[PDB]
Design a protein around this ligand. Structure first.
Ligand SMILES: Nc1ncnc2c1ncn2[C@@H]1O[C@H](COP(=O)(O)OP(=O)(O)OP(=O)(O)O)[C@@H](O)[C@H]1O
Ligand SMILES: Nc1ncnc2c1ncn2[C@@H]1O[C@H](COP(=O)(O)OP(=O)(O)O)[C@@H](O)[C@H]1O
Ligand SMILES: Nc1ncnc2c1ncn2[C@@H]1O[C@H](COP(=O)(O)OP(=O)(O)O)[C@@H](O)[C@H]1O
Ligand SMILES: Nc1ncnc2c1ncn2[C@@H]1O[C@H](COP(=O)(O)OP(=O)(O)O)[C@@H](O)[C@H]1O
Ligand SMILES: [Mg+2]
Lengths: 80, 1622, 193
């Protein structure tokens, strides 16, 4: 269908735009005493978690648009 | 022989025990000493039970049995006698002391006279023989007590009007409930029973002081103990009426407070205008007067001094005596500060704290005045401050004091507030006072809004206490309707009290609009009373409230506080907002509060501590990881400061004790200077905040503490006694205990944190994922505290979301305005009353369940400092100091910041409950508790020893569980679900070993056989528990992983996976294929509902289900529709003759009421000494409640399912709550089995992780092509034995069927249409149709068989299709499949496109030509027109096809239709036409505008009676337009799926149905007399006779919605898509 | 007869008041009728087949809401109350609302105080249109604030000027008015520093 192909192209472009990798920050005995690291670890943590979630969801959307996998309730809602 | 000795002791005690009797005004001799009898009976029962433990109990068993019997009779008799005695006592004082009730209410006056005569007769009989058994052996004594209680309750419930008149007589009675107001009125003579009712009637009066005669009221008292002595005592002898002397006490309280204030002001004038103050004299003055009076005297003195100083420099150029005022304030503040640095009595300490706060505010104000160079008394920089003016020359004492702010003037109400916690007068509080006073002067309300915990309600209460007013806090909600608020407003108007309606926006918008009227009228009355032209002689302004004229007192006001933007809040209409002066409270001055609080508690470094603690709180808010349960607002800081003060006091006491025990040298100054205040603050902060933190935030917060508080460390105390009690309790409950870093250190540390939080807060929240040990933690803590402190601890576990909020808190009848207690309200009221000594015990109310603002916001006042449960009827319940409110939740994703900030939090992570602890608990329970109820123990211990190496850290089980978390499961995988499945399967293995031993008495199982069997079954159980809820691929993957890591010998088979193998009792692997024989089904049993062709999946799932059900363990089968879940479960249940299955069919609107109706029908409640037990009516049988759509029920906006929570409560806790009388009901011989589609299917919701913890899930997927080939080849071979010539075609026929069904499933999916579901149900229907067509026929060539096959394929796969291209595809694919699998056949004869089969033209089901069928239908239509309905119809081919389909459906048992098509297409007419042919009687419900659910229930009852009792075939035609409510669809769902509605016939309607069914069975010739067999026969008759034809429009979203609200419409109803005319 | 709609007793009172006023010719006002759309439709049907008195008037004050039935809107005459288009219209509305006798009291400086208050109210309300720049949020600066400010001005002018015809501009309590309208009247709704 038309909407399936349009969403496939949009999701492919979005995957191209969004980067793929983000490594968490390492805990150290003297690093915890630094509030900069205390904030900075939280930033990289949230960034990596949300990036992984978004990448997985968009990959599932692309997979559905190609028909390889079935639609679920959450997947249907995200498509909508 | 100690058993006989103690039995003789108990015999002597009971024979010597007599009933203590005391007179009642020379009328009766009441029972006294209830507690002694109660605990005597309790101790005797416990002793007899402990004797039952002993083995020598057998020789005295029968005697001790009769002893427990009579002891239970004594308990039952006196569990009602005390209540009856109290009810008669306070009812007598109403029907005797009051004379107006005789004329007003004569009928129940005479009724009470008769009941009192009966009670005095029984009571004189008791007085004659005061022996306990002589009372007990009285004939019908228990029944007499029960009927007396019933009659007294009936009389009590009919006294509402008299109570309303009594409330009108004394205005303060409006805030007293019906029970308590009757208690007060009846017990007026006995004033000692009114002491516990004064706290709900006055601000700070908790009790009154009486002389020895109890006839003269000398004074009043507060909850702390502060006393006010009346100058003129009030005598109750002169004023016998309760209301009269209560009013006199109130007026005397006001006058004596005024006079004492005058004396205190005159005395404190010396302390003012004085350079130096002697500490002794000031302390004496403080101790002489009350806290409010000394604070008021200080305020008056300071205000007068400042006014005099300002008047002195009115000339501008004069001197500055304001510096003298500042110096005096500073000197007094220094004297106060030195006073608190040493030990003080608690009352004097609170007085000093209040004075220090007030004087700090005075110093700040005076400094501000000096800085601004204020020199005129009329300057607004001074007029804006709250100034107190005292006029001793005023004759009226109540008007001697005037409080002014800006242009507003108020009079002190002189209401005794007791000792209330004063708040620091921060600039925000000053702004609040200014705005609220400006609103009050303009005769408006107050609307302080903002986020939670910014000092809004407390600010309103503090302002009210500042003016000496009575402030009432009403926790508003959605049931505060127009009438309840009108009554509350009437009470406030008559009393003259302030009403602080916090959470005002929780009302409905319509209710707020309605209340705006009353608010406007009250404000107008206040405004007219404000005008000076009004005089005392002129009648007070009378506002009209609730169609009544109510006097309006000047002192009253309406304050509403609300949080804007929070969840579960409405909007205020503009006509209501214009009546209130709103104020924004967003940023309280936390630093000033902290500094002044630390200064008043005695901290020398208060400023530094506050400046270090407030930025610390901001750092915590902005630096720790964001979580839903984290709160760092003003409430958290308040708790921290209070805990710091308590810790400082305890440290001072400990130092003093160390000094007295070690020598004799104590100096208050030495201790004060040498005290680590920083350490105290850190200890309080850690005790309050560390428990709520996640694992990764603890080191972050500790580093933060080291950064802001360097050099100070926290050393948590070692509660050695509590740790010993925890160790003992864990040992008795088979729990793993560990100190520090041992196995279980984190859990016990969490328990200690929970204890510390309970010591501080009265509201707790144990937040953490399922299976983190919260329940065990708080249970172990409760038992340890009970066994340590010696105070019995009881717990009331309430599932808040398993019941409606009306059932949880209570309901108010809109008609009669009577209050019915909810669950939590009933529990709290029972604890408060303490009729059975509940106030001396540790009461914990645990709200185990999900939390949302709808139900938890009603507890805001309870969790606040108010500790009041405000009810819509104006009642308020004070939380006793021994009651704790606990919330055991898994997440806090839906609660607002109001609830999170109100409760201390303890966060339990899943790392708290390590897997080794669960393994140790399982092993201990296995080694201790017998499974039968000993060879059982020996087998259990041997097996546990065998499984010990695997149930270890980094063992086979742990590694397998870790890997199983990485696979894909149909339902979300939780550790505890897998562990519970494994433990249940291992228990079943132990029972299998025991059964093997029983079957072989001569040769029991040896050690080696046990080892082999246990190891192999452990691997088997791990495989089937960690991957039972996954596809075959994941099962094979887990099997391969186990084969790698495991060392135990596993099947040597090359490609066959391990899951294809069972563990025989001999201790060897045997493939499941050995239990799958090539059976030959009987010809007449082809595709029968109870016929199951054995396959590999069938036998595996049958064994698994038998294993799980033999443990009575709840389980859920999840899989696609038609996979075989119900069939497999019924096959497994057929191997258990002692289990009866009852079918439940959940829908989107399913509520626990369905389960309650099923319990009412199939079970019965019986009263037992341990409580109510619900058991099935049949004896020795286990009721298996089979819920077919367990995950379908609607999920609210807060992610909960009420029926799912109900099932979770009934599974985990083993019972539920009867909402009729709030009685705990324990389930007996009842287990639950669930069925559901995968949660990814539309309309299905994922089950809560707390529910999935208890229920194993087995994934029953579609049978494979090989399995389908086997099953339906067997079915065809059995079926094709009718025609011997056709026997050779069974193999190609089943192949063709399987191929076409596989193609149909792939081509049409649920993505296209909601009803496009295909399952082996279609194949079963195919085989049934072919067999039914072939049954009467004697011979038939292959072409006829292919024609029948094609016709059945068309009727199954093409009837439900929507588009034309899909039907064309189905026809073409049928043709291609038949030609592919059946070559060398003549296509034209067997596959002529108009495939029509009908039995109208012959006795058998044979093909019919189109034209002959059309002519026959024309003739039948002519007859139909002449007989039933004269509406001409035009006949075409589609009409013939449709009538053939309807005739096909109507001839089947339980054949229901779902006709989907545009209106006017003839669906109803064709249904009536076919039904008239087939003899069915057409029934249609006549829906009108007033048609409700009860009329539908009556129509259903009539149709079921006709279809089951009279054996009359009925075609119940029902249209979608006939659906008005969801109840219609729910009852239709139940009737379609089961054939009987459980709650439809009840009471009289049930008995008449029983009689009619008996008559019907007599007519059929059956011999049935029991209700169960007759009801089963009725259900069978309804199934056989009732057909439901459902017609609806082809809506797109409507079909999807109906696929969820009524799932049975798509599972039991054959779907025909008539559509529009082509 | 003004009745607040939303309760069953409110519906009964509205019915009785309308039935009485259609004969007696009195006015009836119902507030917040958008909360009962079905009763609104029933009321419209009742009104259509009715021949009331010549002086009878029925006012249905409601908020702009899509739930209001279309037939009632077609039956009645619609008046929209909303912010005035500009500063000039705002001042004109404020001066029209306040009675003339109230402004023209004994102190001749009362008129200038009222004019300053009206200009301040217009300035405050017009800044509301540009939500991010004029303020930080859509505050509810309405007619209630204007009435409260006028009452405060009256009270403090009568307190300072004891009935004198003229009062020196220095003696006018500027501090009182500024502090009150900054902290309680207009500053109450303000939640931002
Ligand atoms: N200290 C312990 N040592 C060993 N086993 C324990 C311990 N505490 C709990 N368990 C076991 O682990 C499981 C946890 O049960 P519990 O009811 O305490 O969980 P929970 O965290 O309250 O769960 P939910 O959120 O579902 O209410 C039970 O099987 C219990 O027997
Ligand atoms: N000036 C103050 N001095 C001391 N404690 C205060 C002060 N203002 C607020 N608090 C405390 O802050 C909390 C606010 O309670 P409350 O006003 O009832 O909450 P809410 O603002 O949500 O209605 C209470 O613990 C209260 O004692
Ligand atoms: N091994 C088997 N032998 C015979 N029939 C089977 C077998 N497996 C599946 N079926 C057929 O599949 C259907 C399963 O339907 P049902 O038990 O209602 O599943 P669900 O309750 O999950 O919808 C039954 O009608 C049955 O005839
Ligand atoms: N085949 C037909 N020929 C002539 N009239 C028909 C035919 N089918 C339906 N009708 C008309 O439809 C009307 C009945 O509609 P009905 O079956 O009640 O609609 P629905 O199927 O939506 O319930 C009758 O008055 C009849 O005239
Ligand atoms: Mg639990």
């Amino acid at each position: 269908p038309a909407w399936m192909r349009t969403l496939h192209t949009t999701a492919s472009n979005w995957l191209h735009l969004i980067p793929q990798t983000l490594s968490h920050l390492k805990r150290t005995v003297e690093n915890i005493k630094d509030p900069l690291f205390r904030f900075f670890e939280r930033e990289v943590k949230m960034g990596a978690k949300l990036l992984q979630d978004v990448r997985q969801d968009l990959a599932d959307v692309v997979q559905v648009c190609e028909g390889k996998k079935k639609q679920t309730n959450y997947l249907r809602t995200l498509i909508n | 022989m100690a058993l006989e000795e103690f039995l003789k002791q108990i015999r002597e005690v009971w024979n010597t025990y007599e009933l203590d009797l005391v007179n009642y005004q020379n009328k009766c001799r009441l029972i006294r000493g209830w507690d002694d009898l109660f605990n005597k009976v309790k101790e005797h029962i416990n002793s007899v039970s402990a004797m039952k433990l002993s083995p020598y109990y057998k020789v005295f068993e029968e005697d001790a049995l009769s002893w427990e019997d009579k002891l239970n009779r004594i308990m039952a008799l006196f569990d009602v006698w005390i209540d009856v005695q109290r009810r008669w006592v306070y009812l007598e004082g109403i029907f005797t002391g009051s004379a107006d009730i005789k004329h007003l209410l004569p009928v129940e006056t005479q009724r009470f006279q008769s009941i009192s005569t009966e009670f005095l007769a029984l009571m004189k009989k008791v007085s004659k023989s005061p022996l306990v058994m002589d009372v007990l052996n009285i004939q019908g004594v228990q029944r007499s007590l029960e009927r007396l209680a019933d009659l007294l309750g009936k009389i009590q419930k009919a006294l509402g009007e008299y109570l309303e008149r009594e409330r009108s007589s004394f205005p303060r009675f409006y805030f007293v409930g019906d029970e308590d107001l009757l208690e007060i009125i009846g017990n007026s003579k006995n004033v000692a029973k009114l002491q516990k009712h004064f706290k709900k009637m006055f601000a700070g009066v908790s009790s009154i002081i009486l002389n020895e005669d109890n006839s003269v009221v000398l004074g009043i008292s507060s909850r702390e103990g502060e006393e006010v002595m009346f100058k003129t005592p009030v005598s109750i002898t002169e004023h016998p009426k309760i209301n009269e002397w209560l009013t006199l006490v109130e007026k005397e309280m006001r006058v004596t407070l005024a006079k004492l204030l005058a004396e205190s002001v005159t005395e404190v004038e010396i302390f003012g205008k004085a350079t130096s103050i002697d500490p002794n004299t000031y302390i004496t003055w403080i101790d002489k007067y009350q806290a409010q009076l000394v604070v008021l005297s200080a305020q008056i003195a300071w205000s007068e001094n400042v006014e005099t100083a300002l008047s002195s420099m009115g000339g501008g150029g004069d001197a500055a005596p304001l510096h003298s005022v500042l110096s005096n304030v500073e000197v007094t503040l220094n004297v106060l500060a030195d006073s608190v640095l040493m030990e003080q009595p608690p009352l004097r300490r609170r007085k000093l704290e209040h004075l220090i706060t007030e004087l700090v505010h005075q110093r700040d104000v005076t400094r501000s005045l000096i800085k601004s160079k204020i020199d005129n008394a009329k300057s607004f920089e001074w007029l804006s401050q709250m100034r107190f003016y005292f006029d001793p020359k005023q004759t009226d004492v109540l008007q001697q004091l005037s409080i002014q702010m800006a242009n507003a003037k108020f009079n002190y109400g002189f209401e005794y507030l007791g000792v209330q916690d004063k708040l620091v007068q921060t600039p925000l509080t000053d702004r609040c006072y200014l705005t609220m006073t400006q609103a009050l002067e303009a005769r408006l309300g107050g609307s302080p809004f903002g986020p939670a915990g910014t000092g809004k309600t407390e600010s309103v209460k503090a302002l009210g206490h500042q003016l000496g007013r009575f402030v009432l806090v009403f926790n508003c909600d959605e049931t505060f309707d127009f009438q309840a608020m009108g009554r509350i407003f009437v009470g406030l108007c008559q009393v003259g009290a302030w009403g602080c309606f916090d959470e005002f926006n929780r009302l409905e918008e319509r209710m707020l609009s309605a209340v705006s009227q009353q608010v406007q009228c009250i404000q107008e009355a206040l405004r007219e009373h404000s005008n000076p032209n009004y005089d005392k002689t002129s009648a007070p302004i009378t506002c009209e409230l609730l169609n009544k004229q109510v006097k309006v007192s000047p002192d009253m006001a309406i304050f509403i506080t609300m949080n804007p933007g929070y969840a579960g809040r409405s909007n205020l209409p503009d006509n209501l907002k214009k009546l209130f002066r709103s104020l924004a409270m967003t940023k309280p001055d936390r630093q000033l509060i902290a500094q002044v609080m630390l200064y008043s508690q005695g901290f020398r470094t208060a400023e530094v501590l506050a400046n270090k603690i407030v930025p610390f709180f901001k750092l915590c808010d902005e630096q720790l990881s964001s979580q839903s349960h984290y709160d760092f607002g003003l409430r958290a800081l308040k708790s921290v400061l209070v805990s710091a003060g308590n810790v400082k006091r305890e440290r001072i006491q400990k130092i003093k004790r160390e000094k007295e025990e070690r020598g004799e040298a104590v100096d208050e100054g030495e201790i004060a200077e040498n005290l680590p205040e920083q350490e105290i603050l850190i200890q309080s902060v850690c005790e309050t905040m560390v428990p709520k933190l996640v694992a990764e935030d603890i080191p972050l917060l500790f580093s933060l503490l080291s950064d802001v508080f360097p050099g100070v460390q926290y050393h948590r105390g070692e509660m050695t006694a509590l740790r010993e009690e925890l160790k003992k309790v864990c040992q008795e409950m088979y729990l793993t205990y560990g100190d520090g870093e041992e196995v279980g250190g984190m859990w016990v540390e969490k328990v200690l944190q929970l204890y510390q939080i309970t010591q501080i807060n009265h509201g707790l929240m144990m937040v953490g994922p399922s299976g983190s040990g919260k329940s065990m933690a708080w249970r172990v803590l409760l038992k340890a505290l009970e066994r340590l402190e010696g105070v019995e601890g009881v717990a009331h576990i309430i599932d808040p979301k398993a019941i409606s909020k009306d059932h949880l808190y209570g309901t108010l009848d809109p008609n009669t305005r009577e209050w019915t207690d909810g669950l939590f309200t009933h529990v709290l009221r029972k604890i408060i009353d303490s009729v059975r000594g509940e106030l001396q015990k540790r009461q914990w109310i645990v709200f185990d369940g999900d939390v949302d603002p709808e139900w938890v916001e009603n507890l805001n006042s309870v969790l606040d400092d108010n500790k009041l449960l405000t009810l819509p009827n104006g009642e308020r319940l004070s939380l006793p100091p021994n009651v704790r409110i606990m919330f055991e939740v898994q997440d806090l994703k839906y609660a607002t910041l109001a609830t999170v900030s109100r409760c201390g939090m303890v966060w339990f992570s899943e790392d708290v409950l390590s897997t080794d602890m669960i393994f140790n608990n399982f092993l201990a329970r296995l080694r201790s508790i017998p499974l039968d109820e000993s060879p059982m123990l020996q087998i259990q211990r041997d097996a546990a020893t065998i499984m010990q190496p695997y149930f270890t850290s980094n063992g086979l089980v742990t590694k397998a569980l870790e890997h199983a978390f990485q696979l894909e499961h149909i339902m979300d995988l939780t550790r505890l679900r897998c562990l519970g499945s494994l433990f249940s399967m291992l228990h079943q293995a132990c029972r299998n070993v025991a059964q093997y031993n029983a079957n072989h008495p001569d040769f029991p199982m040896q050690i080696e056989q046990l080892e082999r069997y246990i190891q192999r079954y452990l691997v088997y159980a791990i495989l089937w528990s960690l991957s039972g809820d996954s596809r075959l691929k994941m099962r094979a993957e887990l099997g391969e992983y186990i084969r790698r890591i495991t060392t135990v010998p596993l099947p040597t088979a090359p490609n066959i996976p391990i899951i294809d193998y069972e563990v025989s009792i001999s201790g060897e692997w045997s493939p499941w294929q050995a239990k799958v024989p090539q059976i030959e089904v009987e010809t007449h049993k082809v595709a029968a509902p109870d016929v199951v062709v054995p396959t590999l999946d069938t036998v595996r799932h049958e064994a698994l289900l038998y294993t799980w059900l033999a443990e009575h363990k709840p389980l859920v089968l999840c899989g696609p529709p038609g996979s075989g879940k119900t069939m497999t479960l019924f096959s497994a249940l057929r191997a258990l003759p002692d289990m009866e299955v009852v079918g439940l069919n959940f829908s989107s609107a399913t509520t626990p009421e369905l389960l309650l109706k099923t319990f009412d029908h199939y079970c019965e409640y019986r009263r037992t000494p341990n409580g109510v037990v619900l058991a099935p009516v049949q004896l020795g049988k286990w009721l298996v409640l089979f819920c077919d759509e367990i995950n379908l029920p609607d999920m609210d906006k807060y992610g909960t399912q009420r029926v799912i929570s109900f099932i979770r409560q009934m599974v985990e806790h083993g019972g539920f709550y009867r909402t009729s009388d709030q009685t705990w009901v324990k389930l007996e011989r009842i287990q639950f089995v669930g069925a559901c589609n995968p949660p990814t299917d539309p309309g299905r919701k994922p089950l809560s992780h707390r529910f999935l913890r208890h229920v194993p899930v087995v994934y029953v997927d579609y049978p494979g092509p090989a399995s389908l080939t086997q099953i339906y080849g067997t079915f065809n071979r059995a079926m094709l034995r009718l025609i011997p010539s056709l026997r050779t075609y069974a193999e190609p026929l089943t192949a063709a069927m399987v191929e076409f069904y596989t193609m149909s499933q792939e081509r049409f999916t649920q993505d296209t249409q909601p009803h496009y579901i295909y399952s082996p149900r279609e194949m079963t229907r195919w085989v049934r149709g072919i067999f039914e067509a072939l049954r009467p026929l004697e011979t038939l060539p292959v072409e006829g068989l292919i024609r029948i096959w094609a016709h059945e394929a068309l009727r199954l796969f093409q009837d439900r299709l929507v588009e034309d291209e899909e039907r064309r595809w189905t026809d073409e694919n049928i043709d291609t499949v038949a030609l592919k699998h059946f070559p060398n056949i003549d296509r034209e004869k067997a596959m002529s496109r108009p495939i029509l089969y009908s039995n109208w033209l012959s006795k058998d089901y044979i093909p019919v030509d189109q034209e002959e069928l059309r002519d026959y239908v024309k003739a039948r239509l002519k007859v139909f027109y002449e007989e039933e309905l004269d509406v001409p119809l035009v006949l075409f081919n589609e009409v013939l096809d449709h009538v053939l389909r309807i005739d096909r459906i109507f001839r089947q048992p339980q054949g229901h239709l779902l006709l989907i098509g545009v209106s006017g297409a003839g669906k109803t007419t064709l249904s009536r036409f076919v039904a008239w042919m087939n003899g069915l009687s057409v029934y249609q419900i006549k829906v009108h505008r007033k048609y409700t659910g009860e009329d539908f229930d009556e129509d259903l009852r009539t149709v079921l009676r006709r279809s089951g009792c009279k054996n009359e075939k009925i075609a119940f035609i029902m249209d979608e337009s006939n659906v008005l409510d969801s109840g219609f669809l729910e009852r239709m769902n139940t009737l379609l799926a089961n054939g009987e509605v459980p709650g439809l016939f009840e009471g009289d309607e049930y008995a008449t149905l029983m009689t009619q069914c008996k008559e019907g069975a007599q007519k059929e010739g059956l011999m049935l007399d029991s209700h169960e067999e007759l009801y089963k026969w009725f259900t069978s008759q309804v199934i056989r006779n009732l057909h439901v034809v459902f017609t609806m429009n082809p809506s797109s979203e409507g079909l999807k919605d109906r696929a969820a609200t009524s799932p049975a419409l798509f599972n039991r109803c054959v779907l025909n898509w008539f559509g529009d005319w082509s | 007869t003004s009745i607040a709609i939303g309760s069953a007793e409110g519906f009964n009172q509205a019915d009785k008041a309308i039935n009485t006023a259609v004969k007696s010719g009195r006015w009836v006002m119902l507030k917040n009728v958008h909360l009962a759309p079905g009763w609104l439709m029933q009321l419209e049907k009742k009104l259509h087949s009715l021949q009331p008195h010549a002086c009878f008037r029925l006012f249905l004050t409601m908020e702009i809401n899509p739930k209001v039935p279309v037939n009632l809107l077609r039956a009645g005459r619609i008046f929209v109350f909303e912010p005035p288009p500009g500063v000039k219209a705002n001042m004109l509305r404020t001066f029209s609302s306040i009675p003339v006798s109230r402004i023209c009291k004994s102190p001749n400086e009362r008129a200038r105080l009222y004019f300053l208050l009206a200009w301040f109210h217009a300035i405050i309300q017009e800044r509301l249109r540009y939500a991010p720049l004029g303020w930080s949020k859509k505050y509810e600066f309405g007619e209630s604030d204007l009435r409260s400010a006028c009452d405060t001005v009256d009270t403090w002018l009568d307190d300072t000027a004891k009935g004198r015809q003229n009062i020196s501009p220095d003696k006018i309590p500027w501090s009182a008015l500024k502090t009150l309208m900054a902290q309680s009247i207009y500053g109450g709704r303000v939640d931002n520093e």
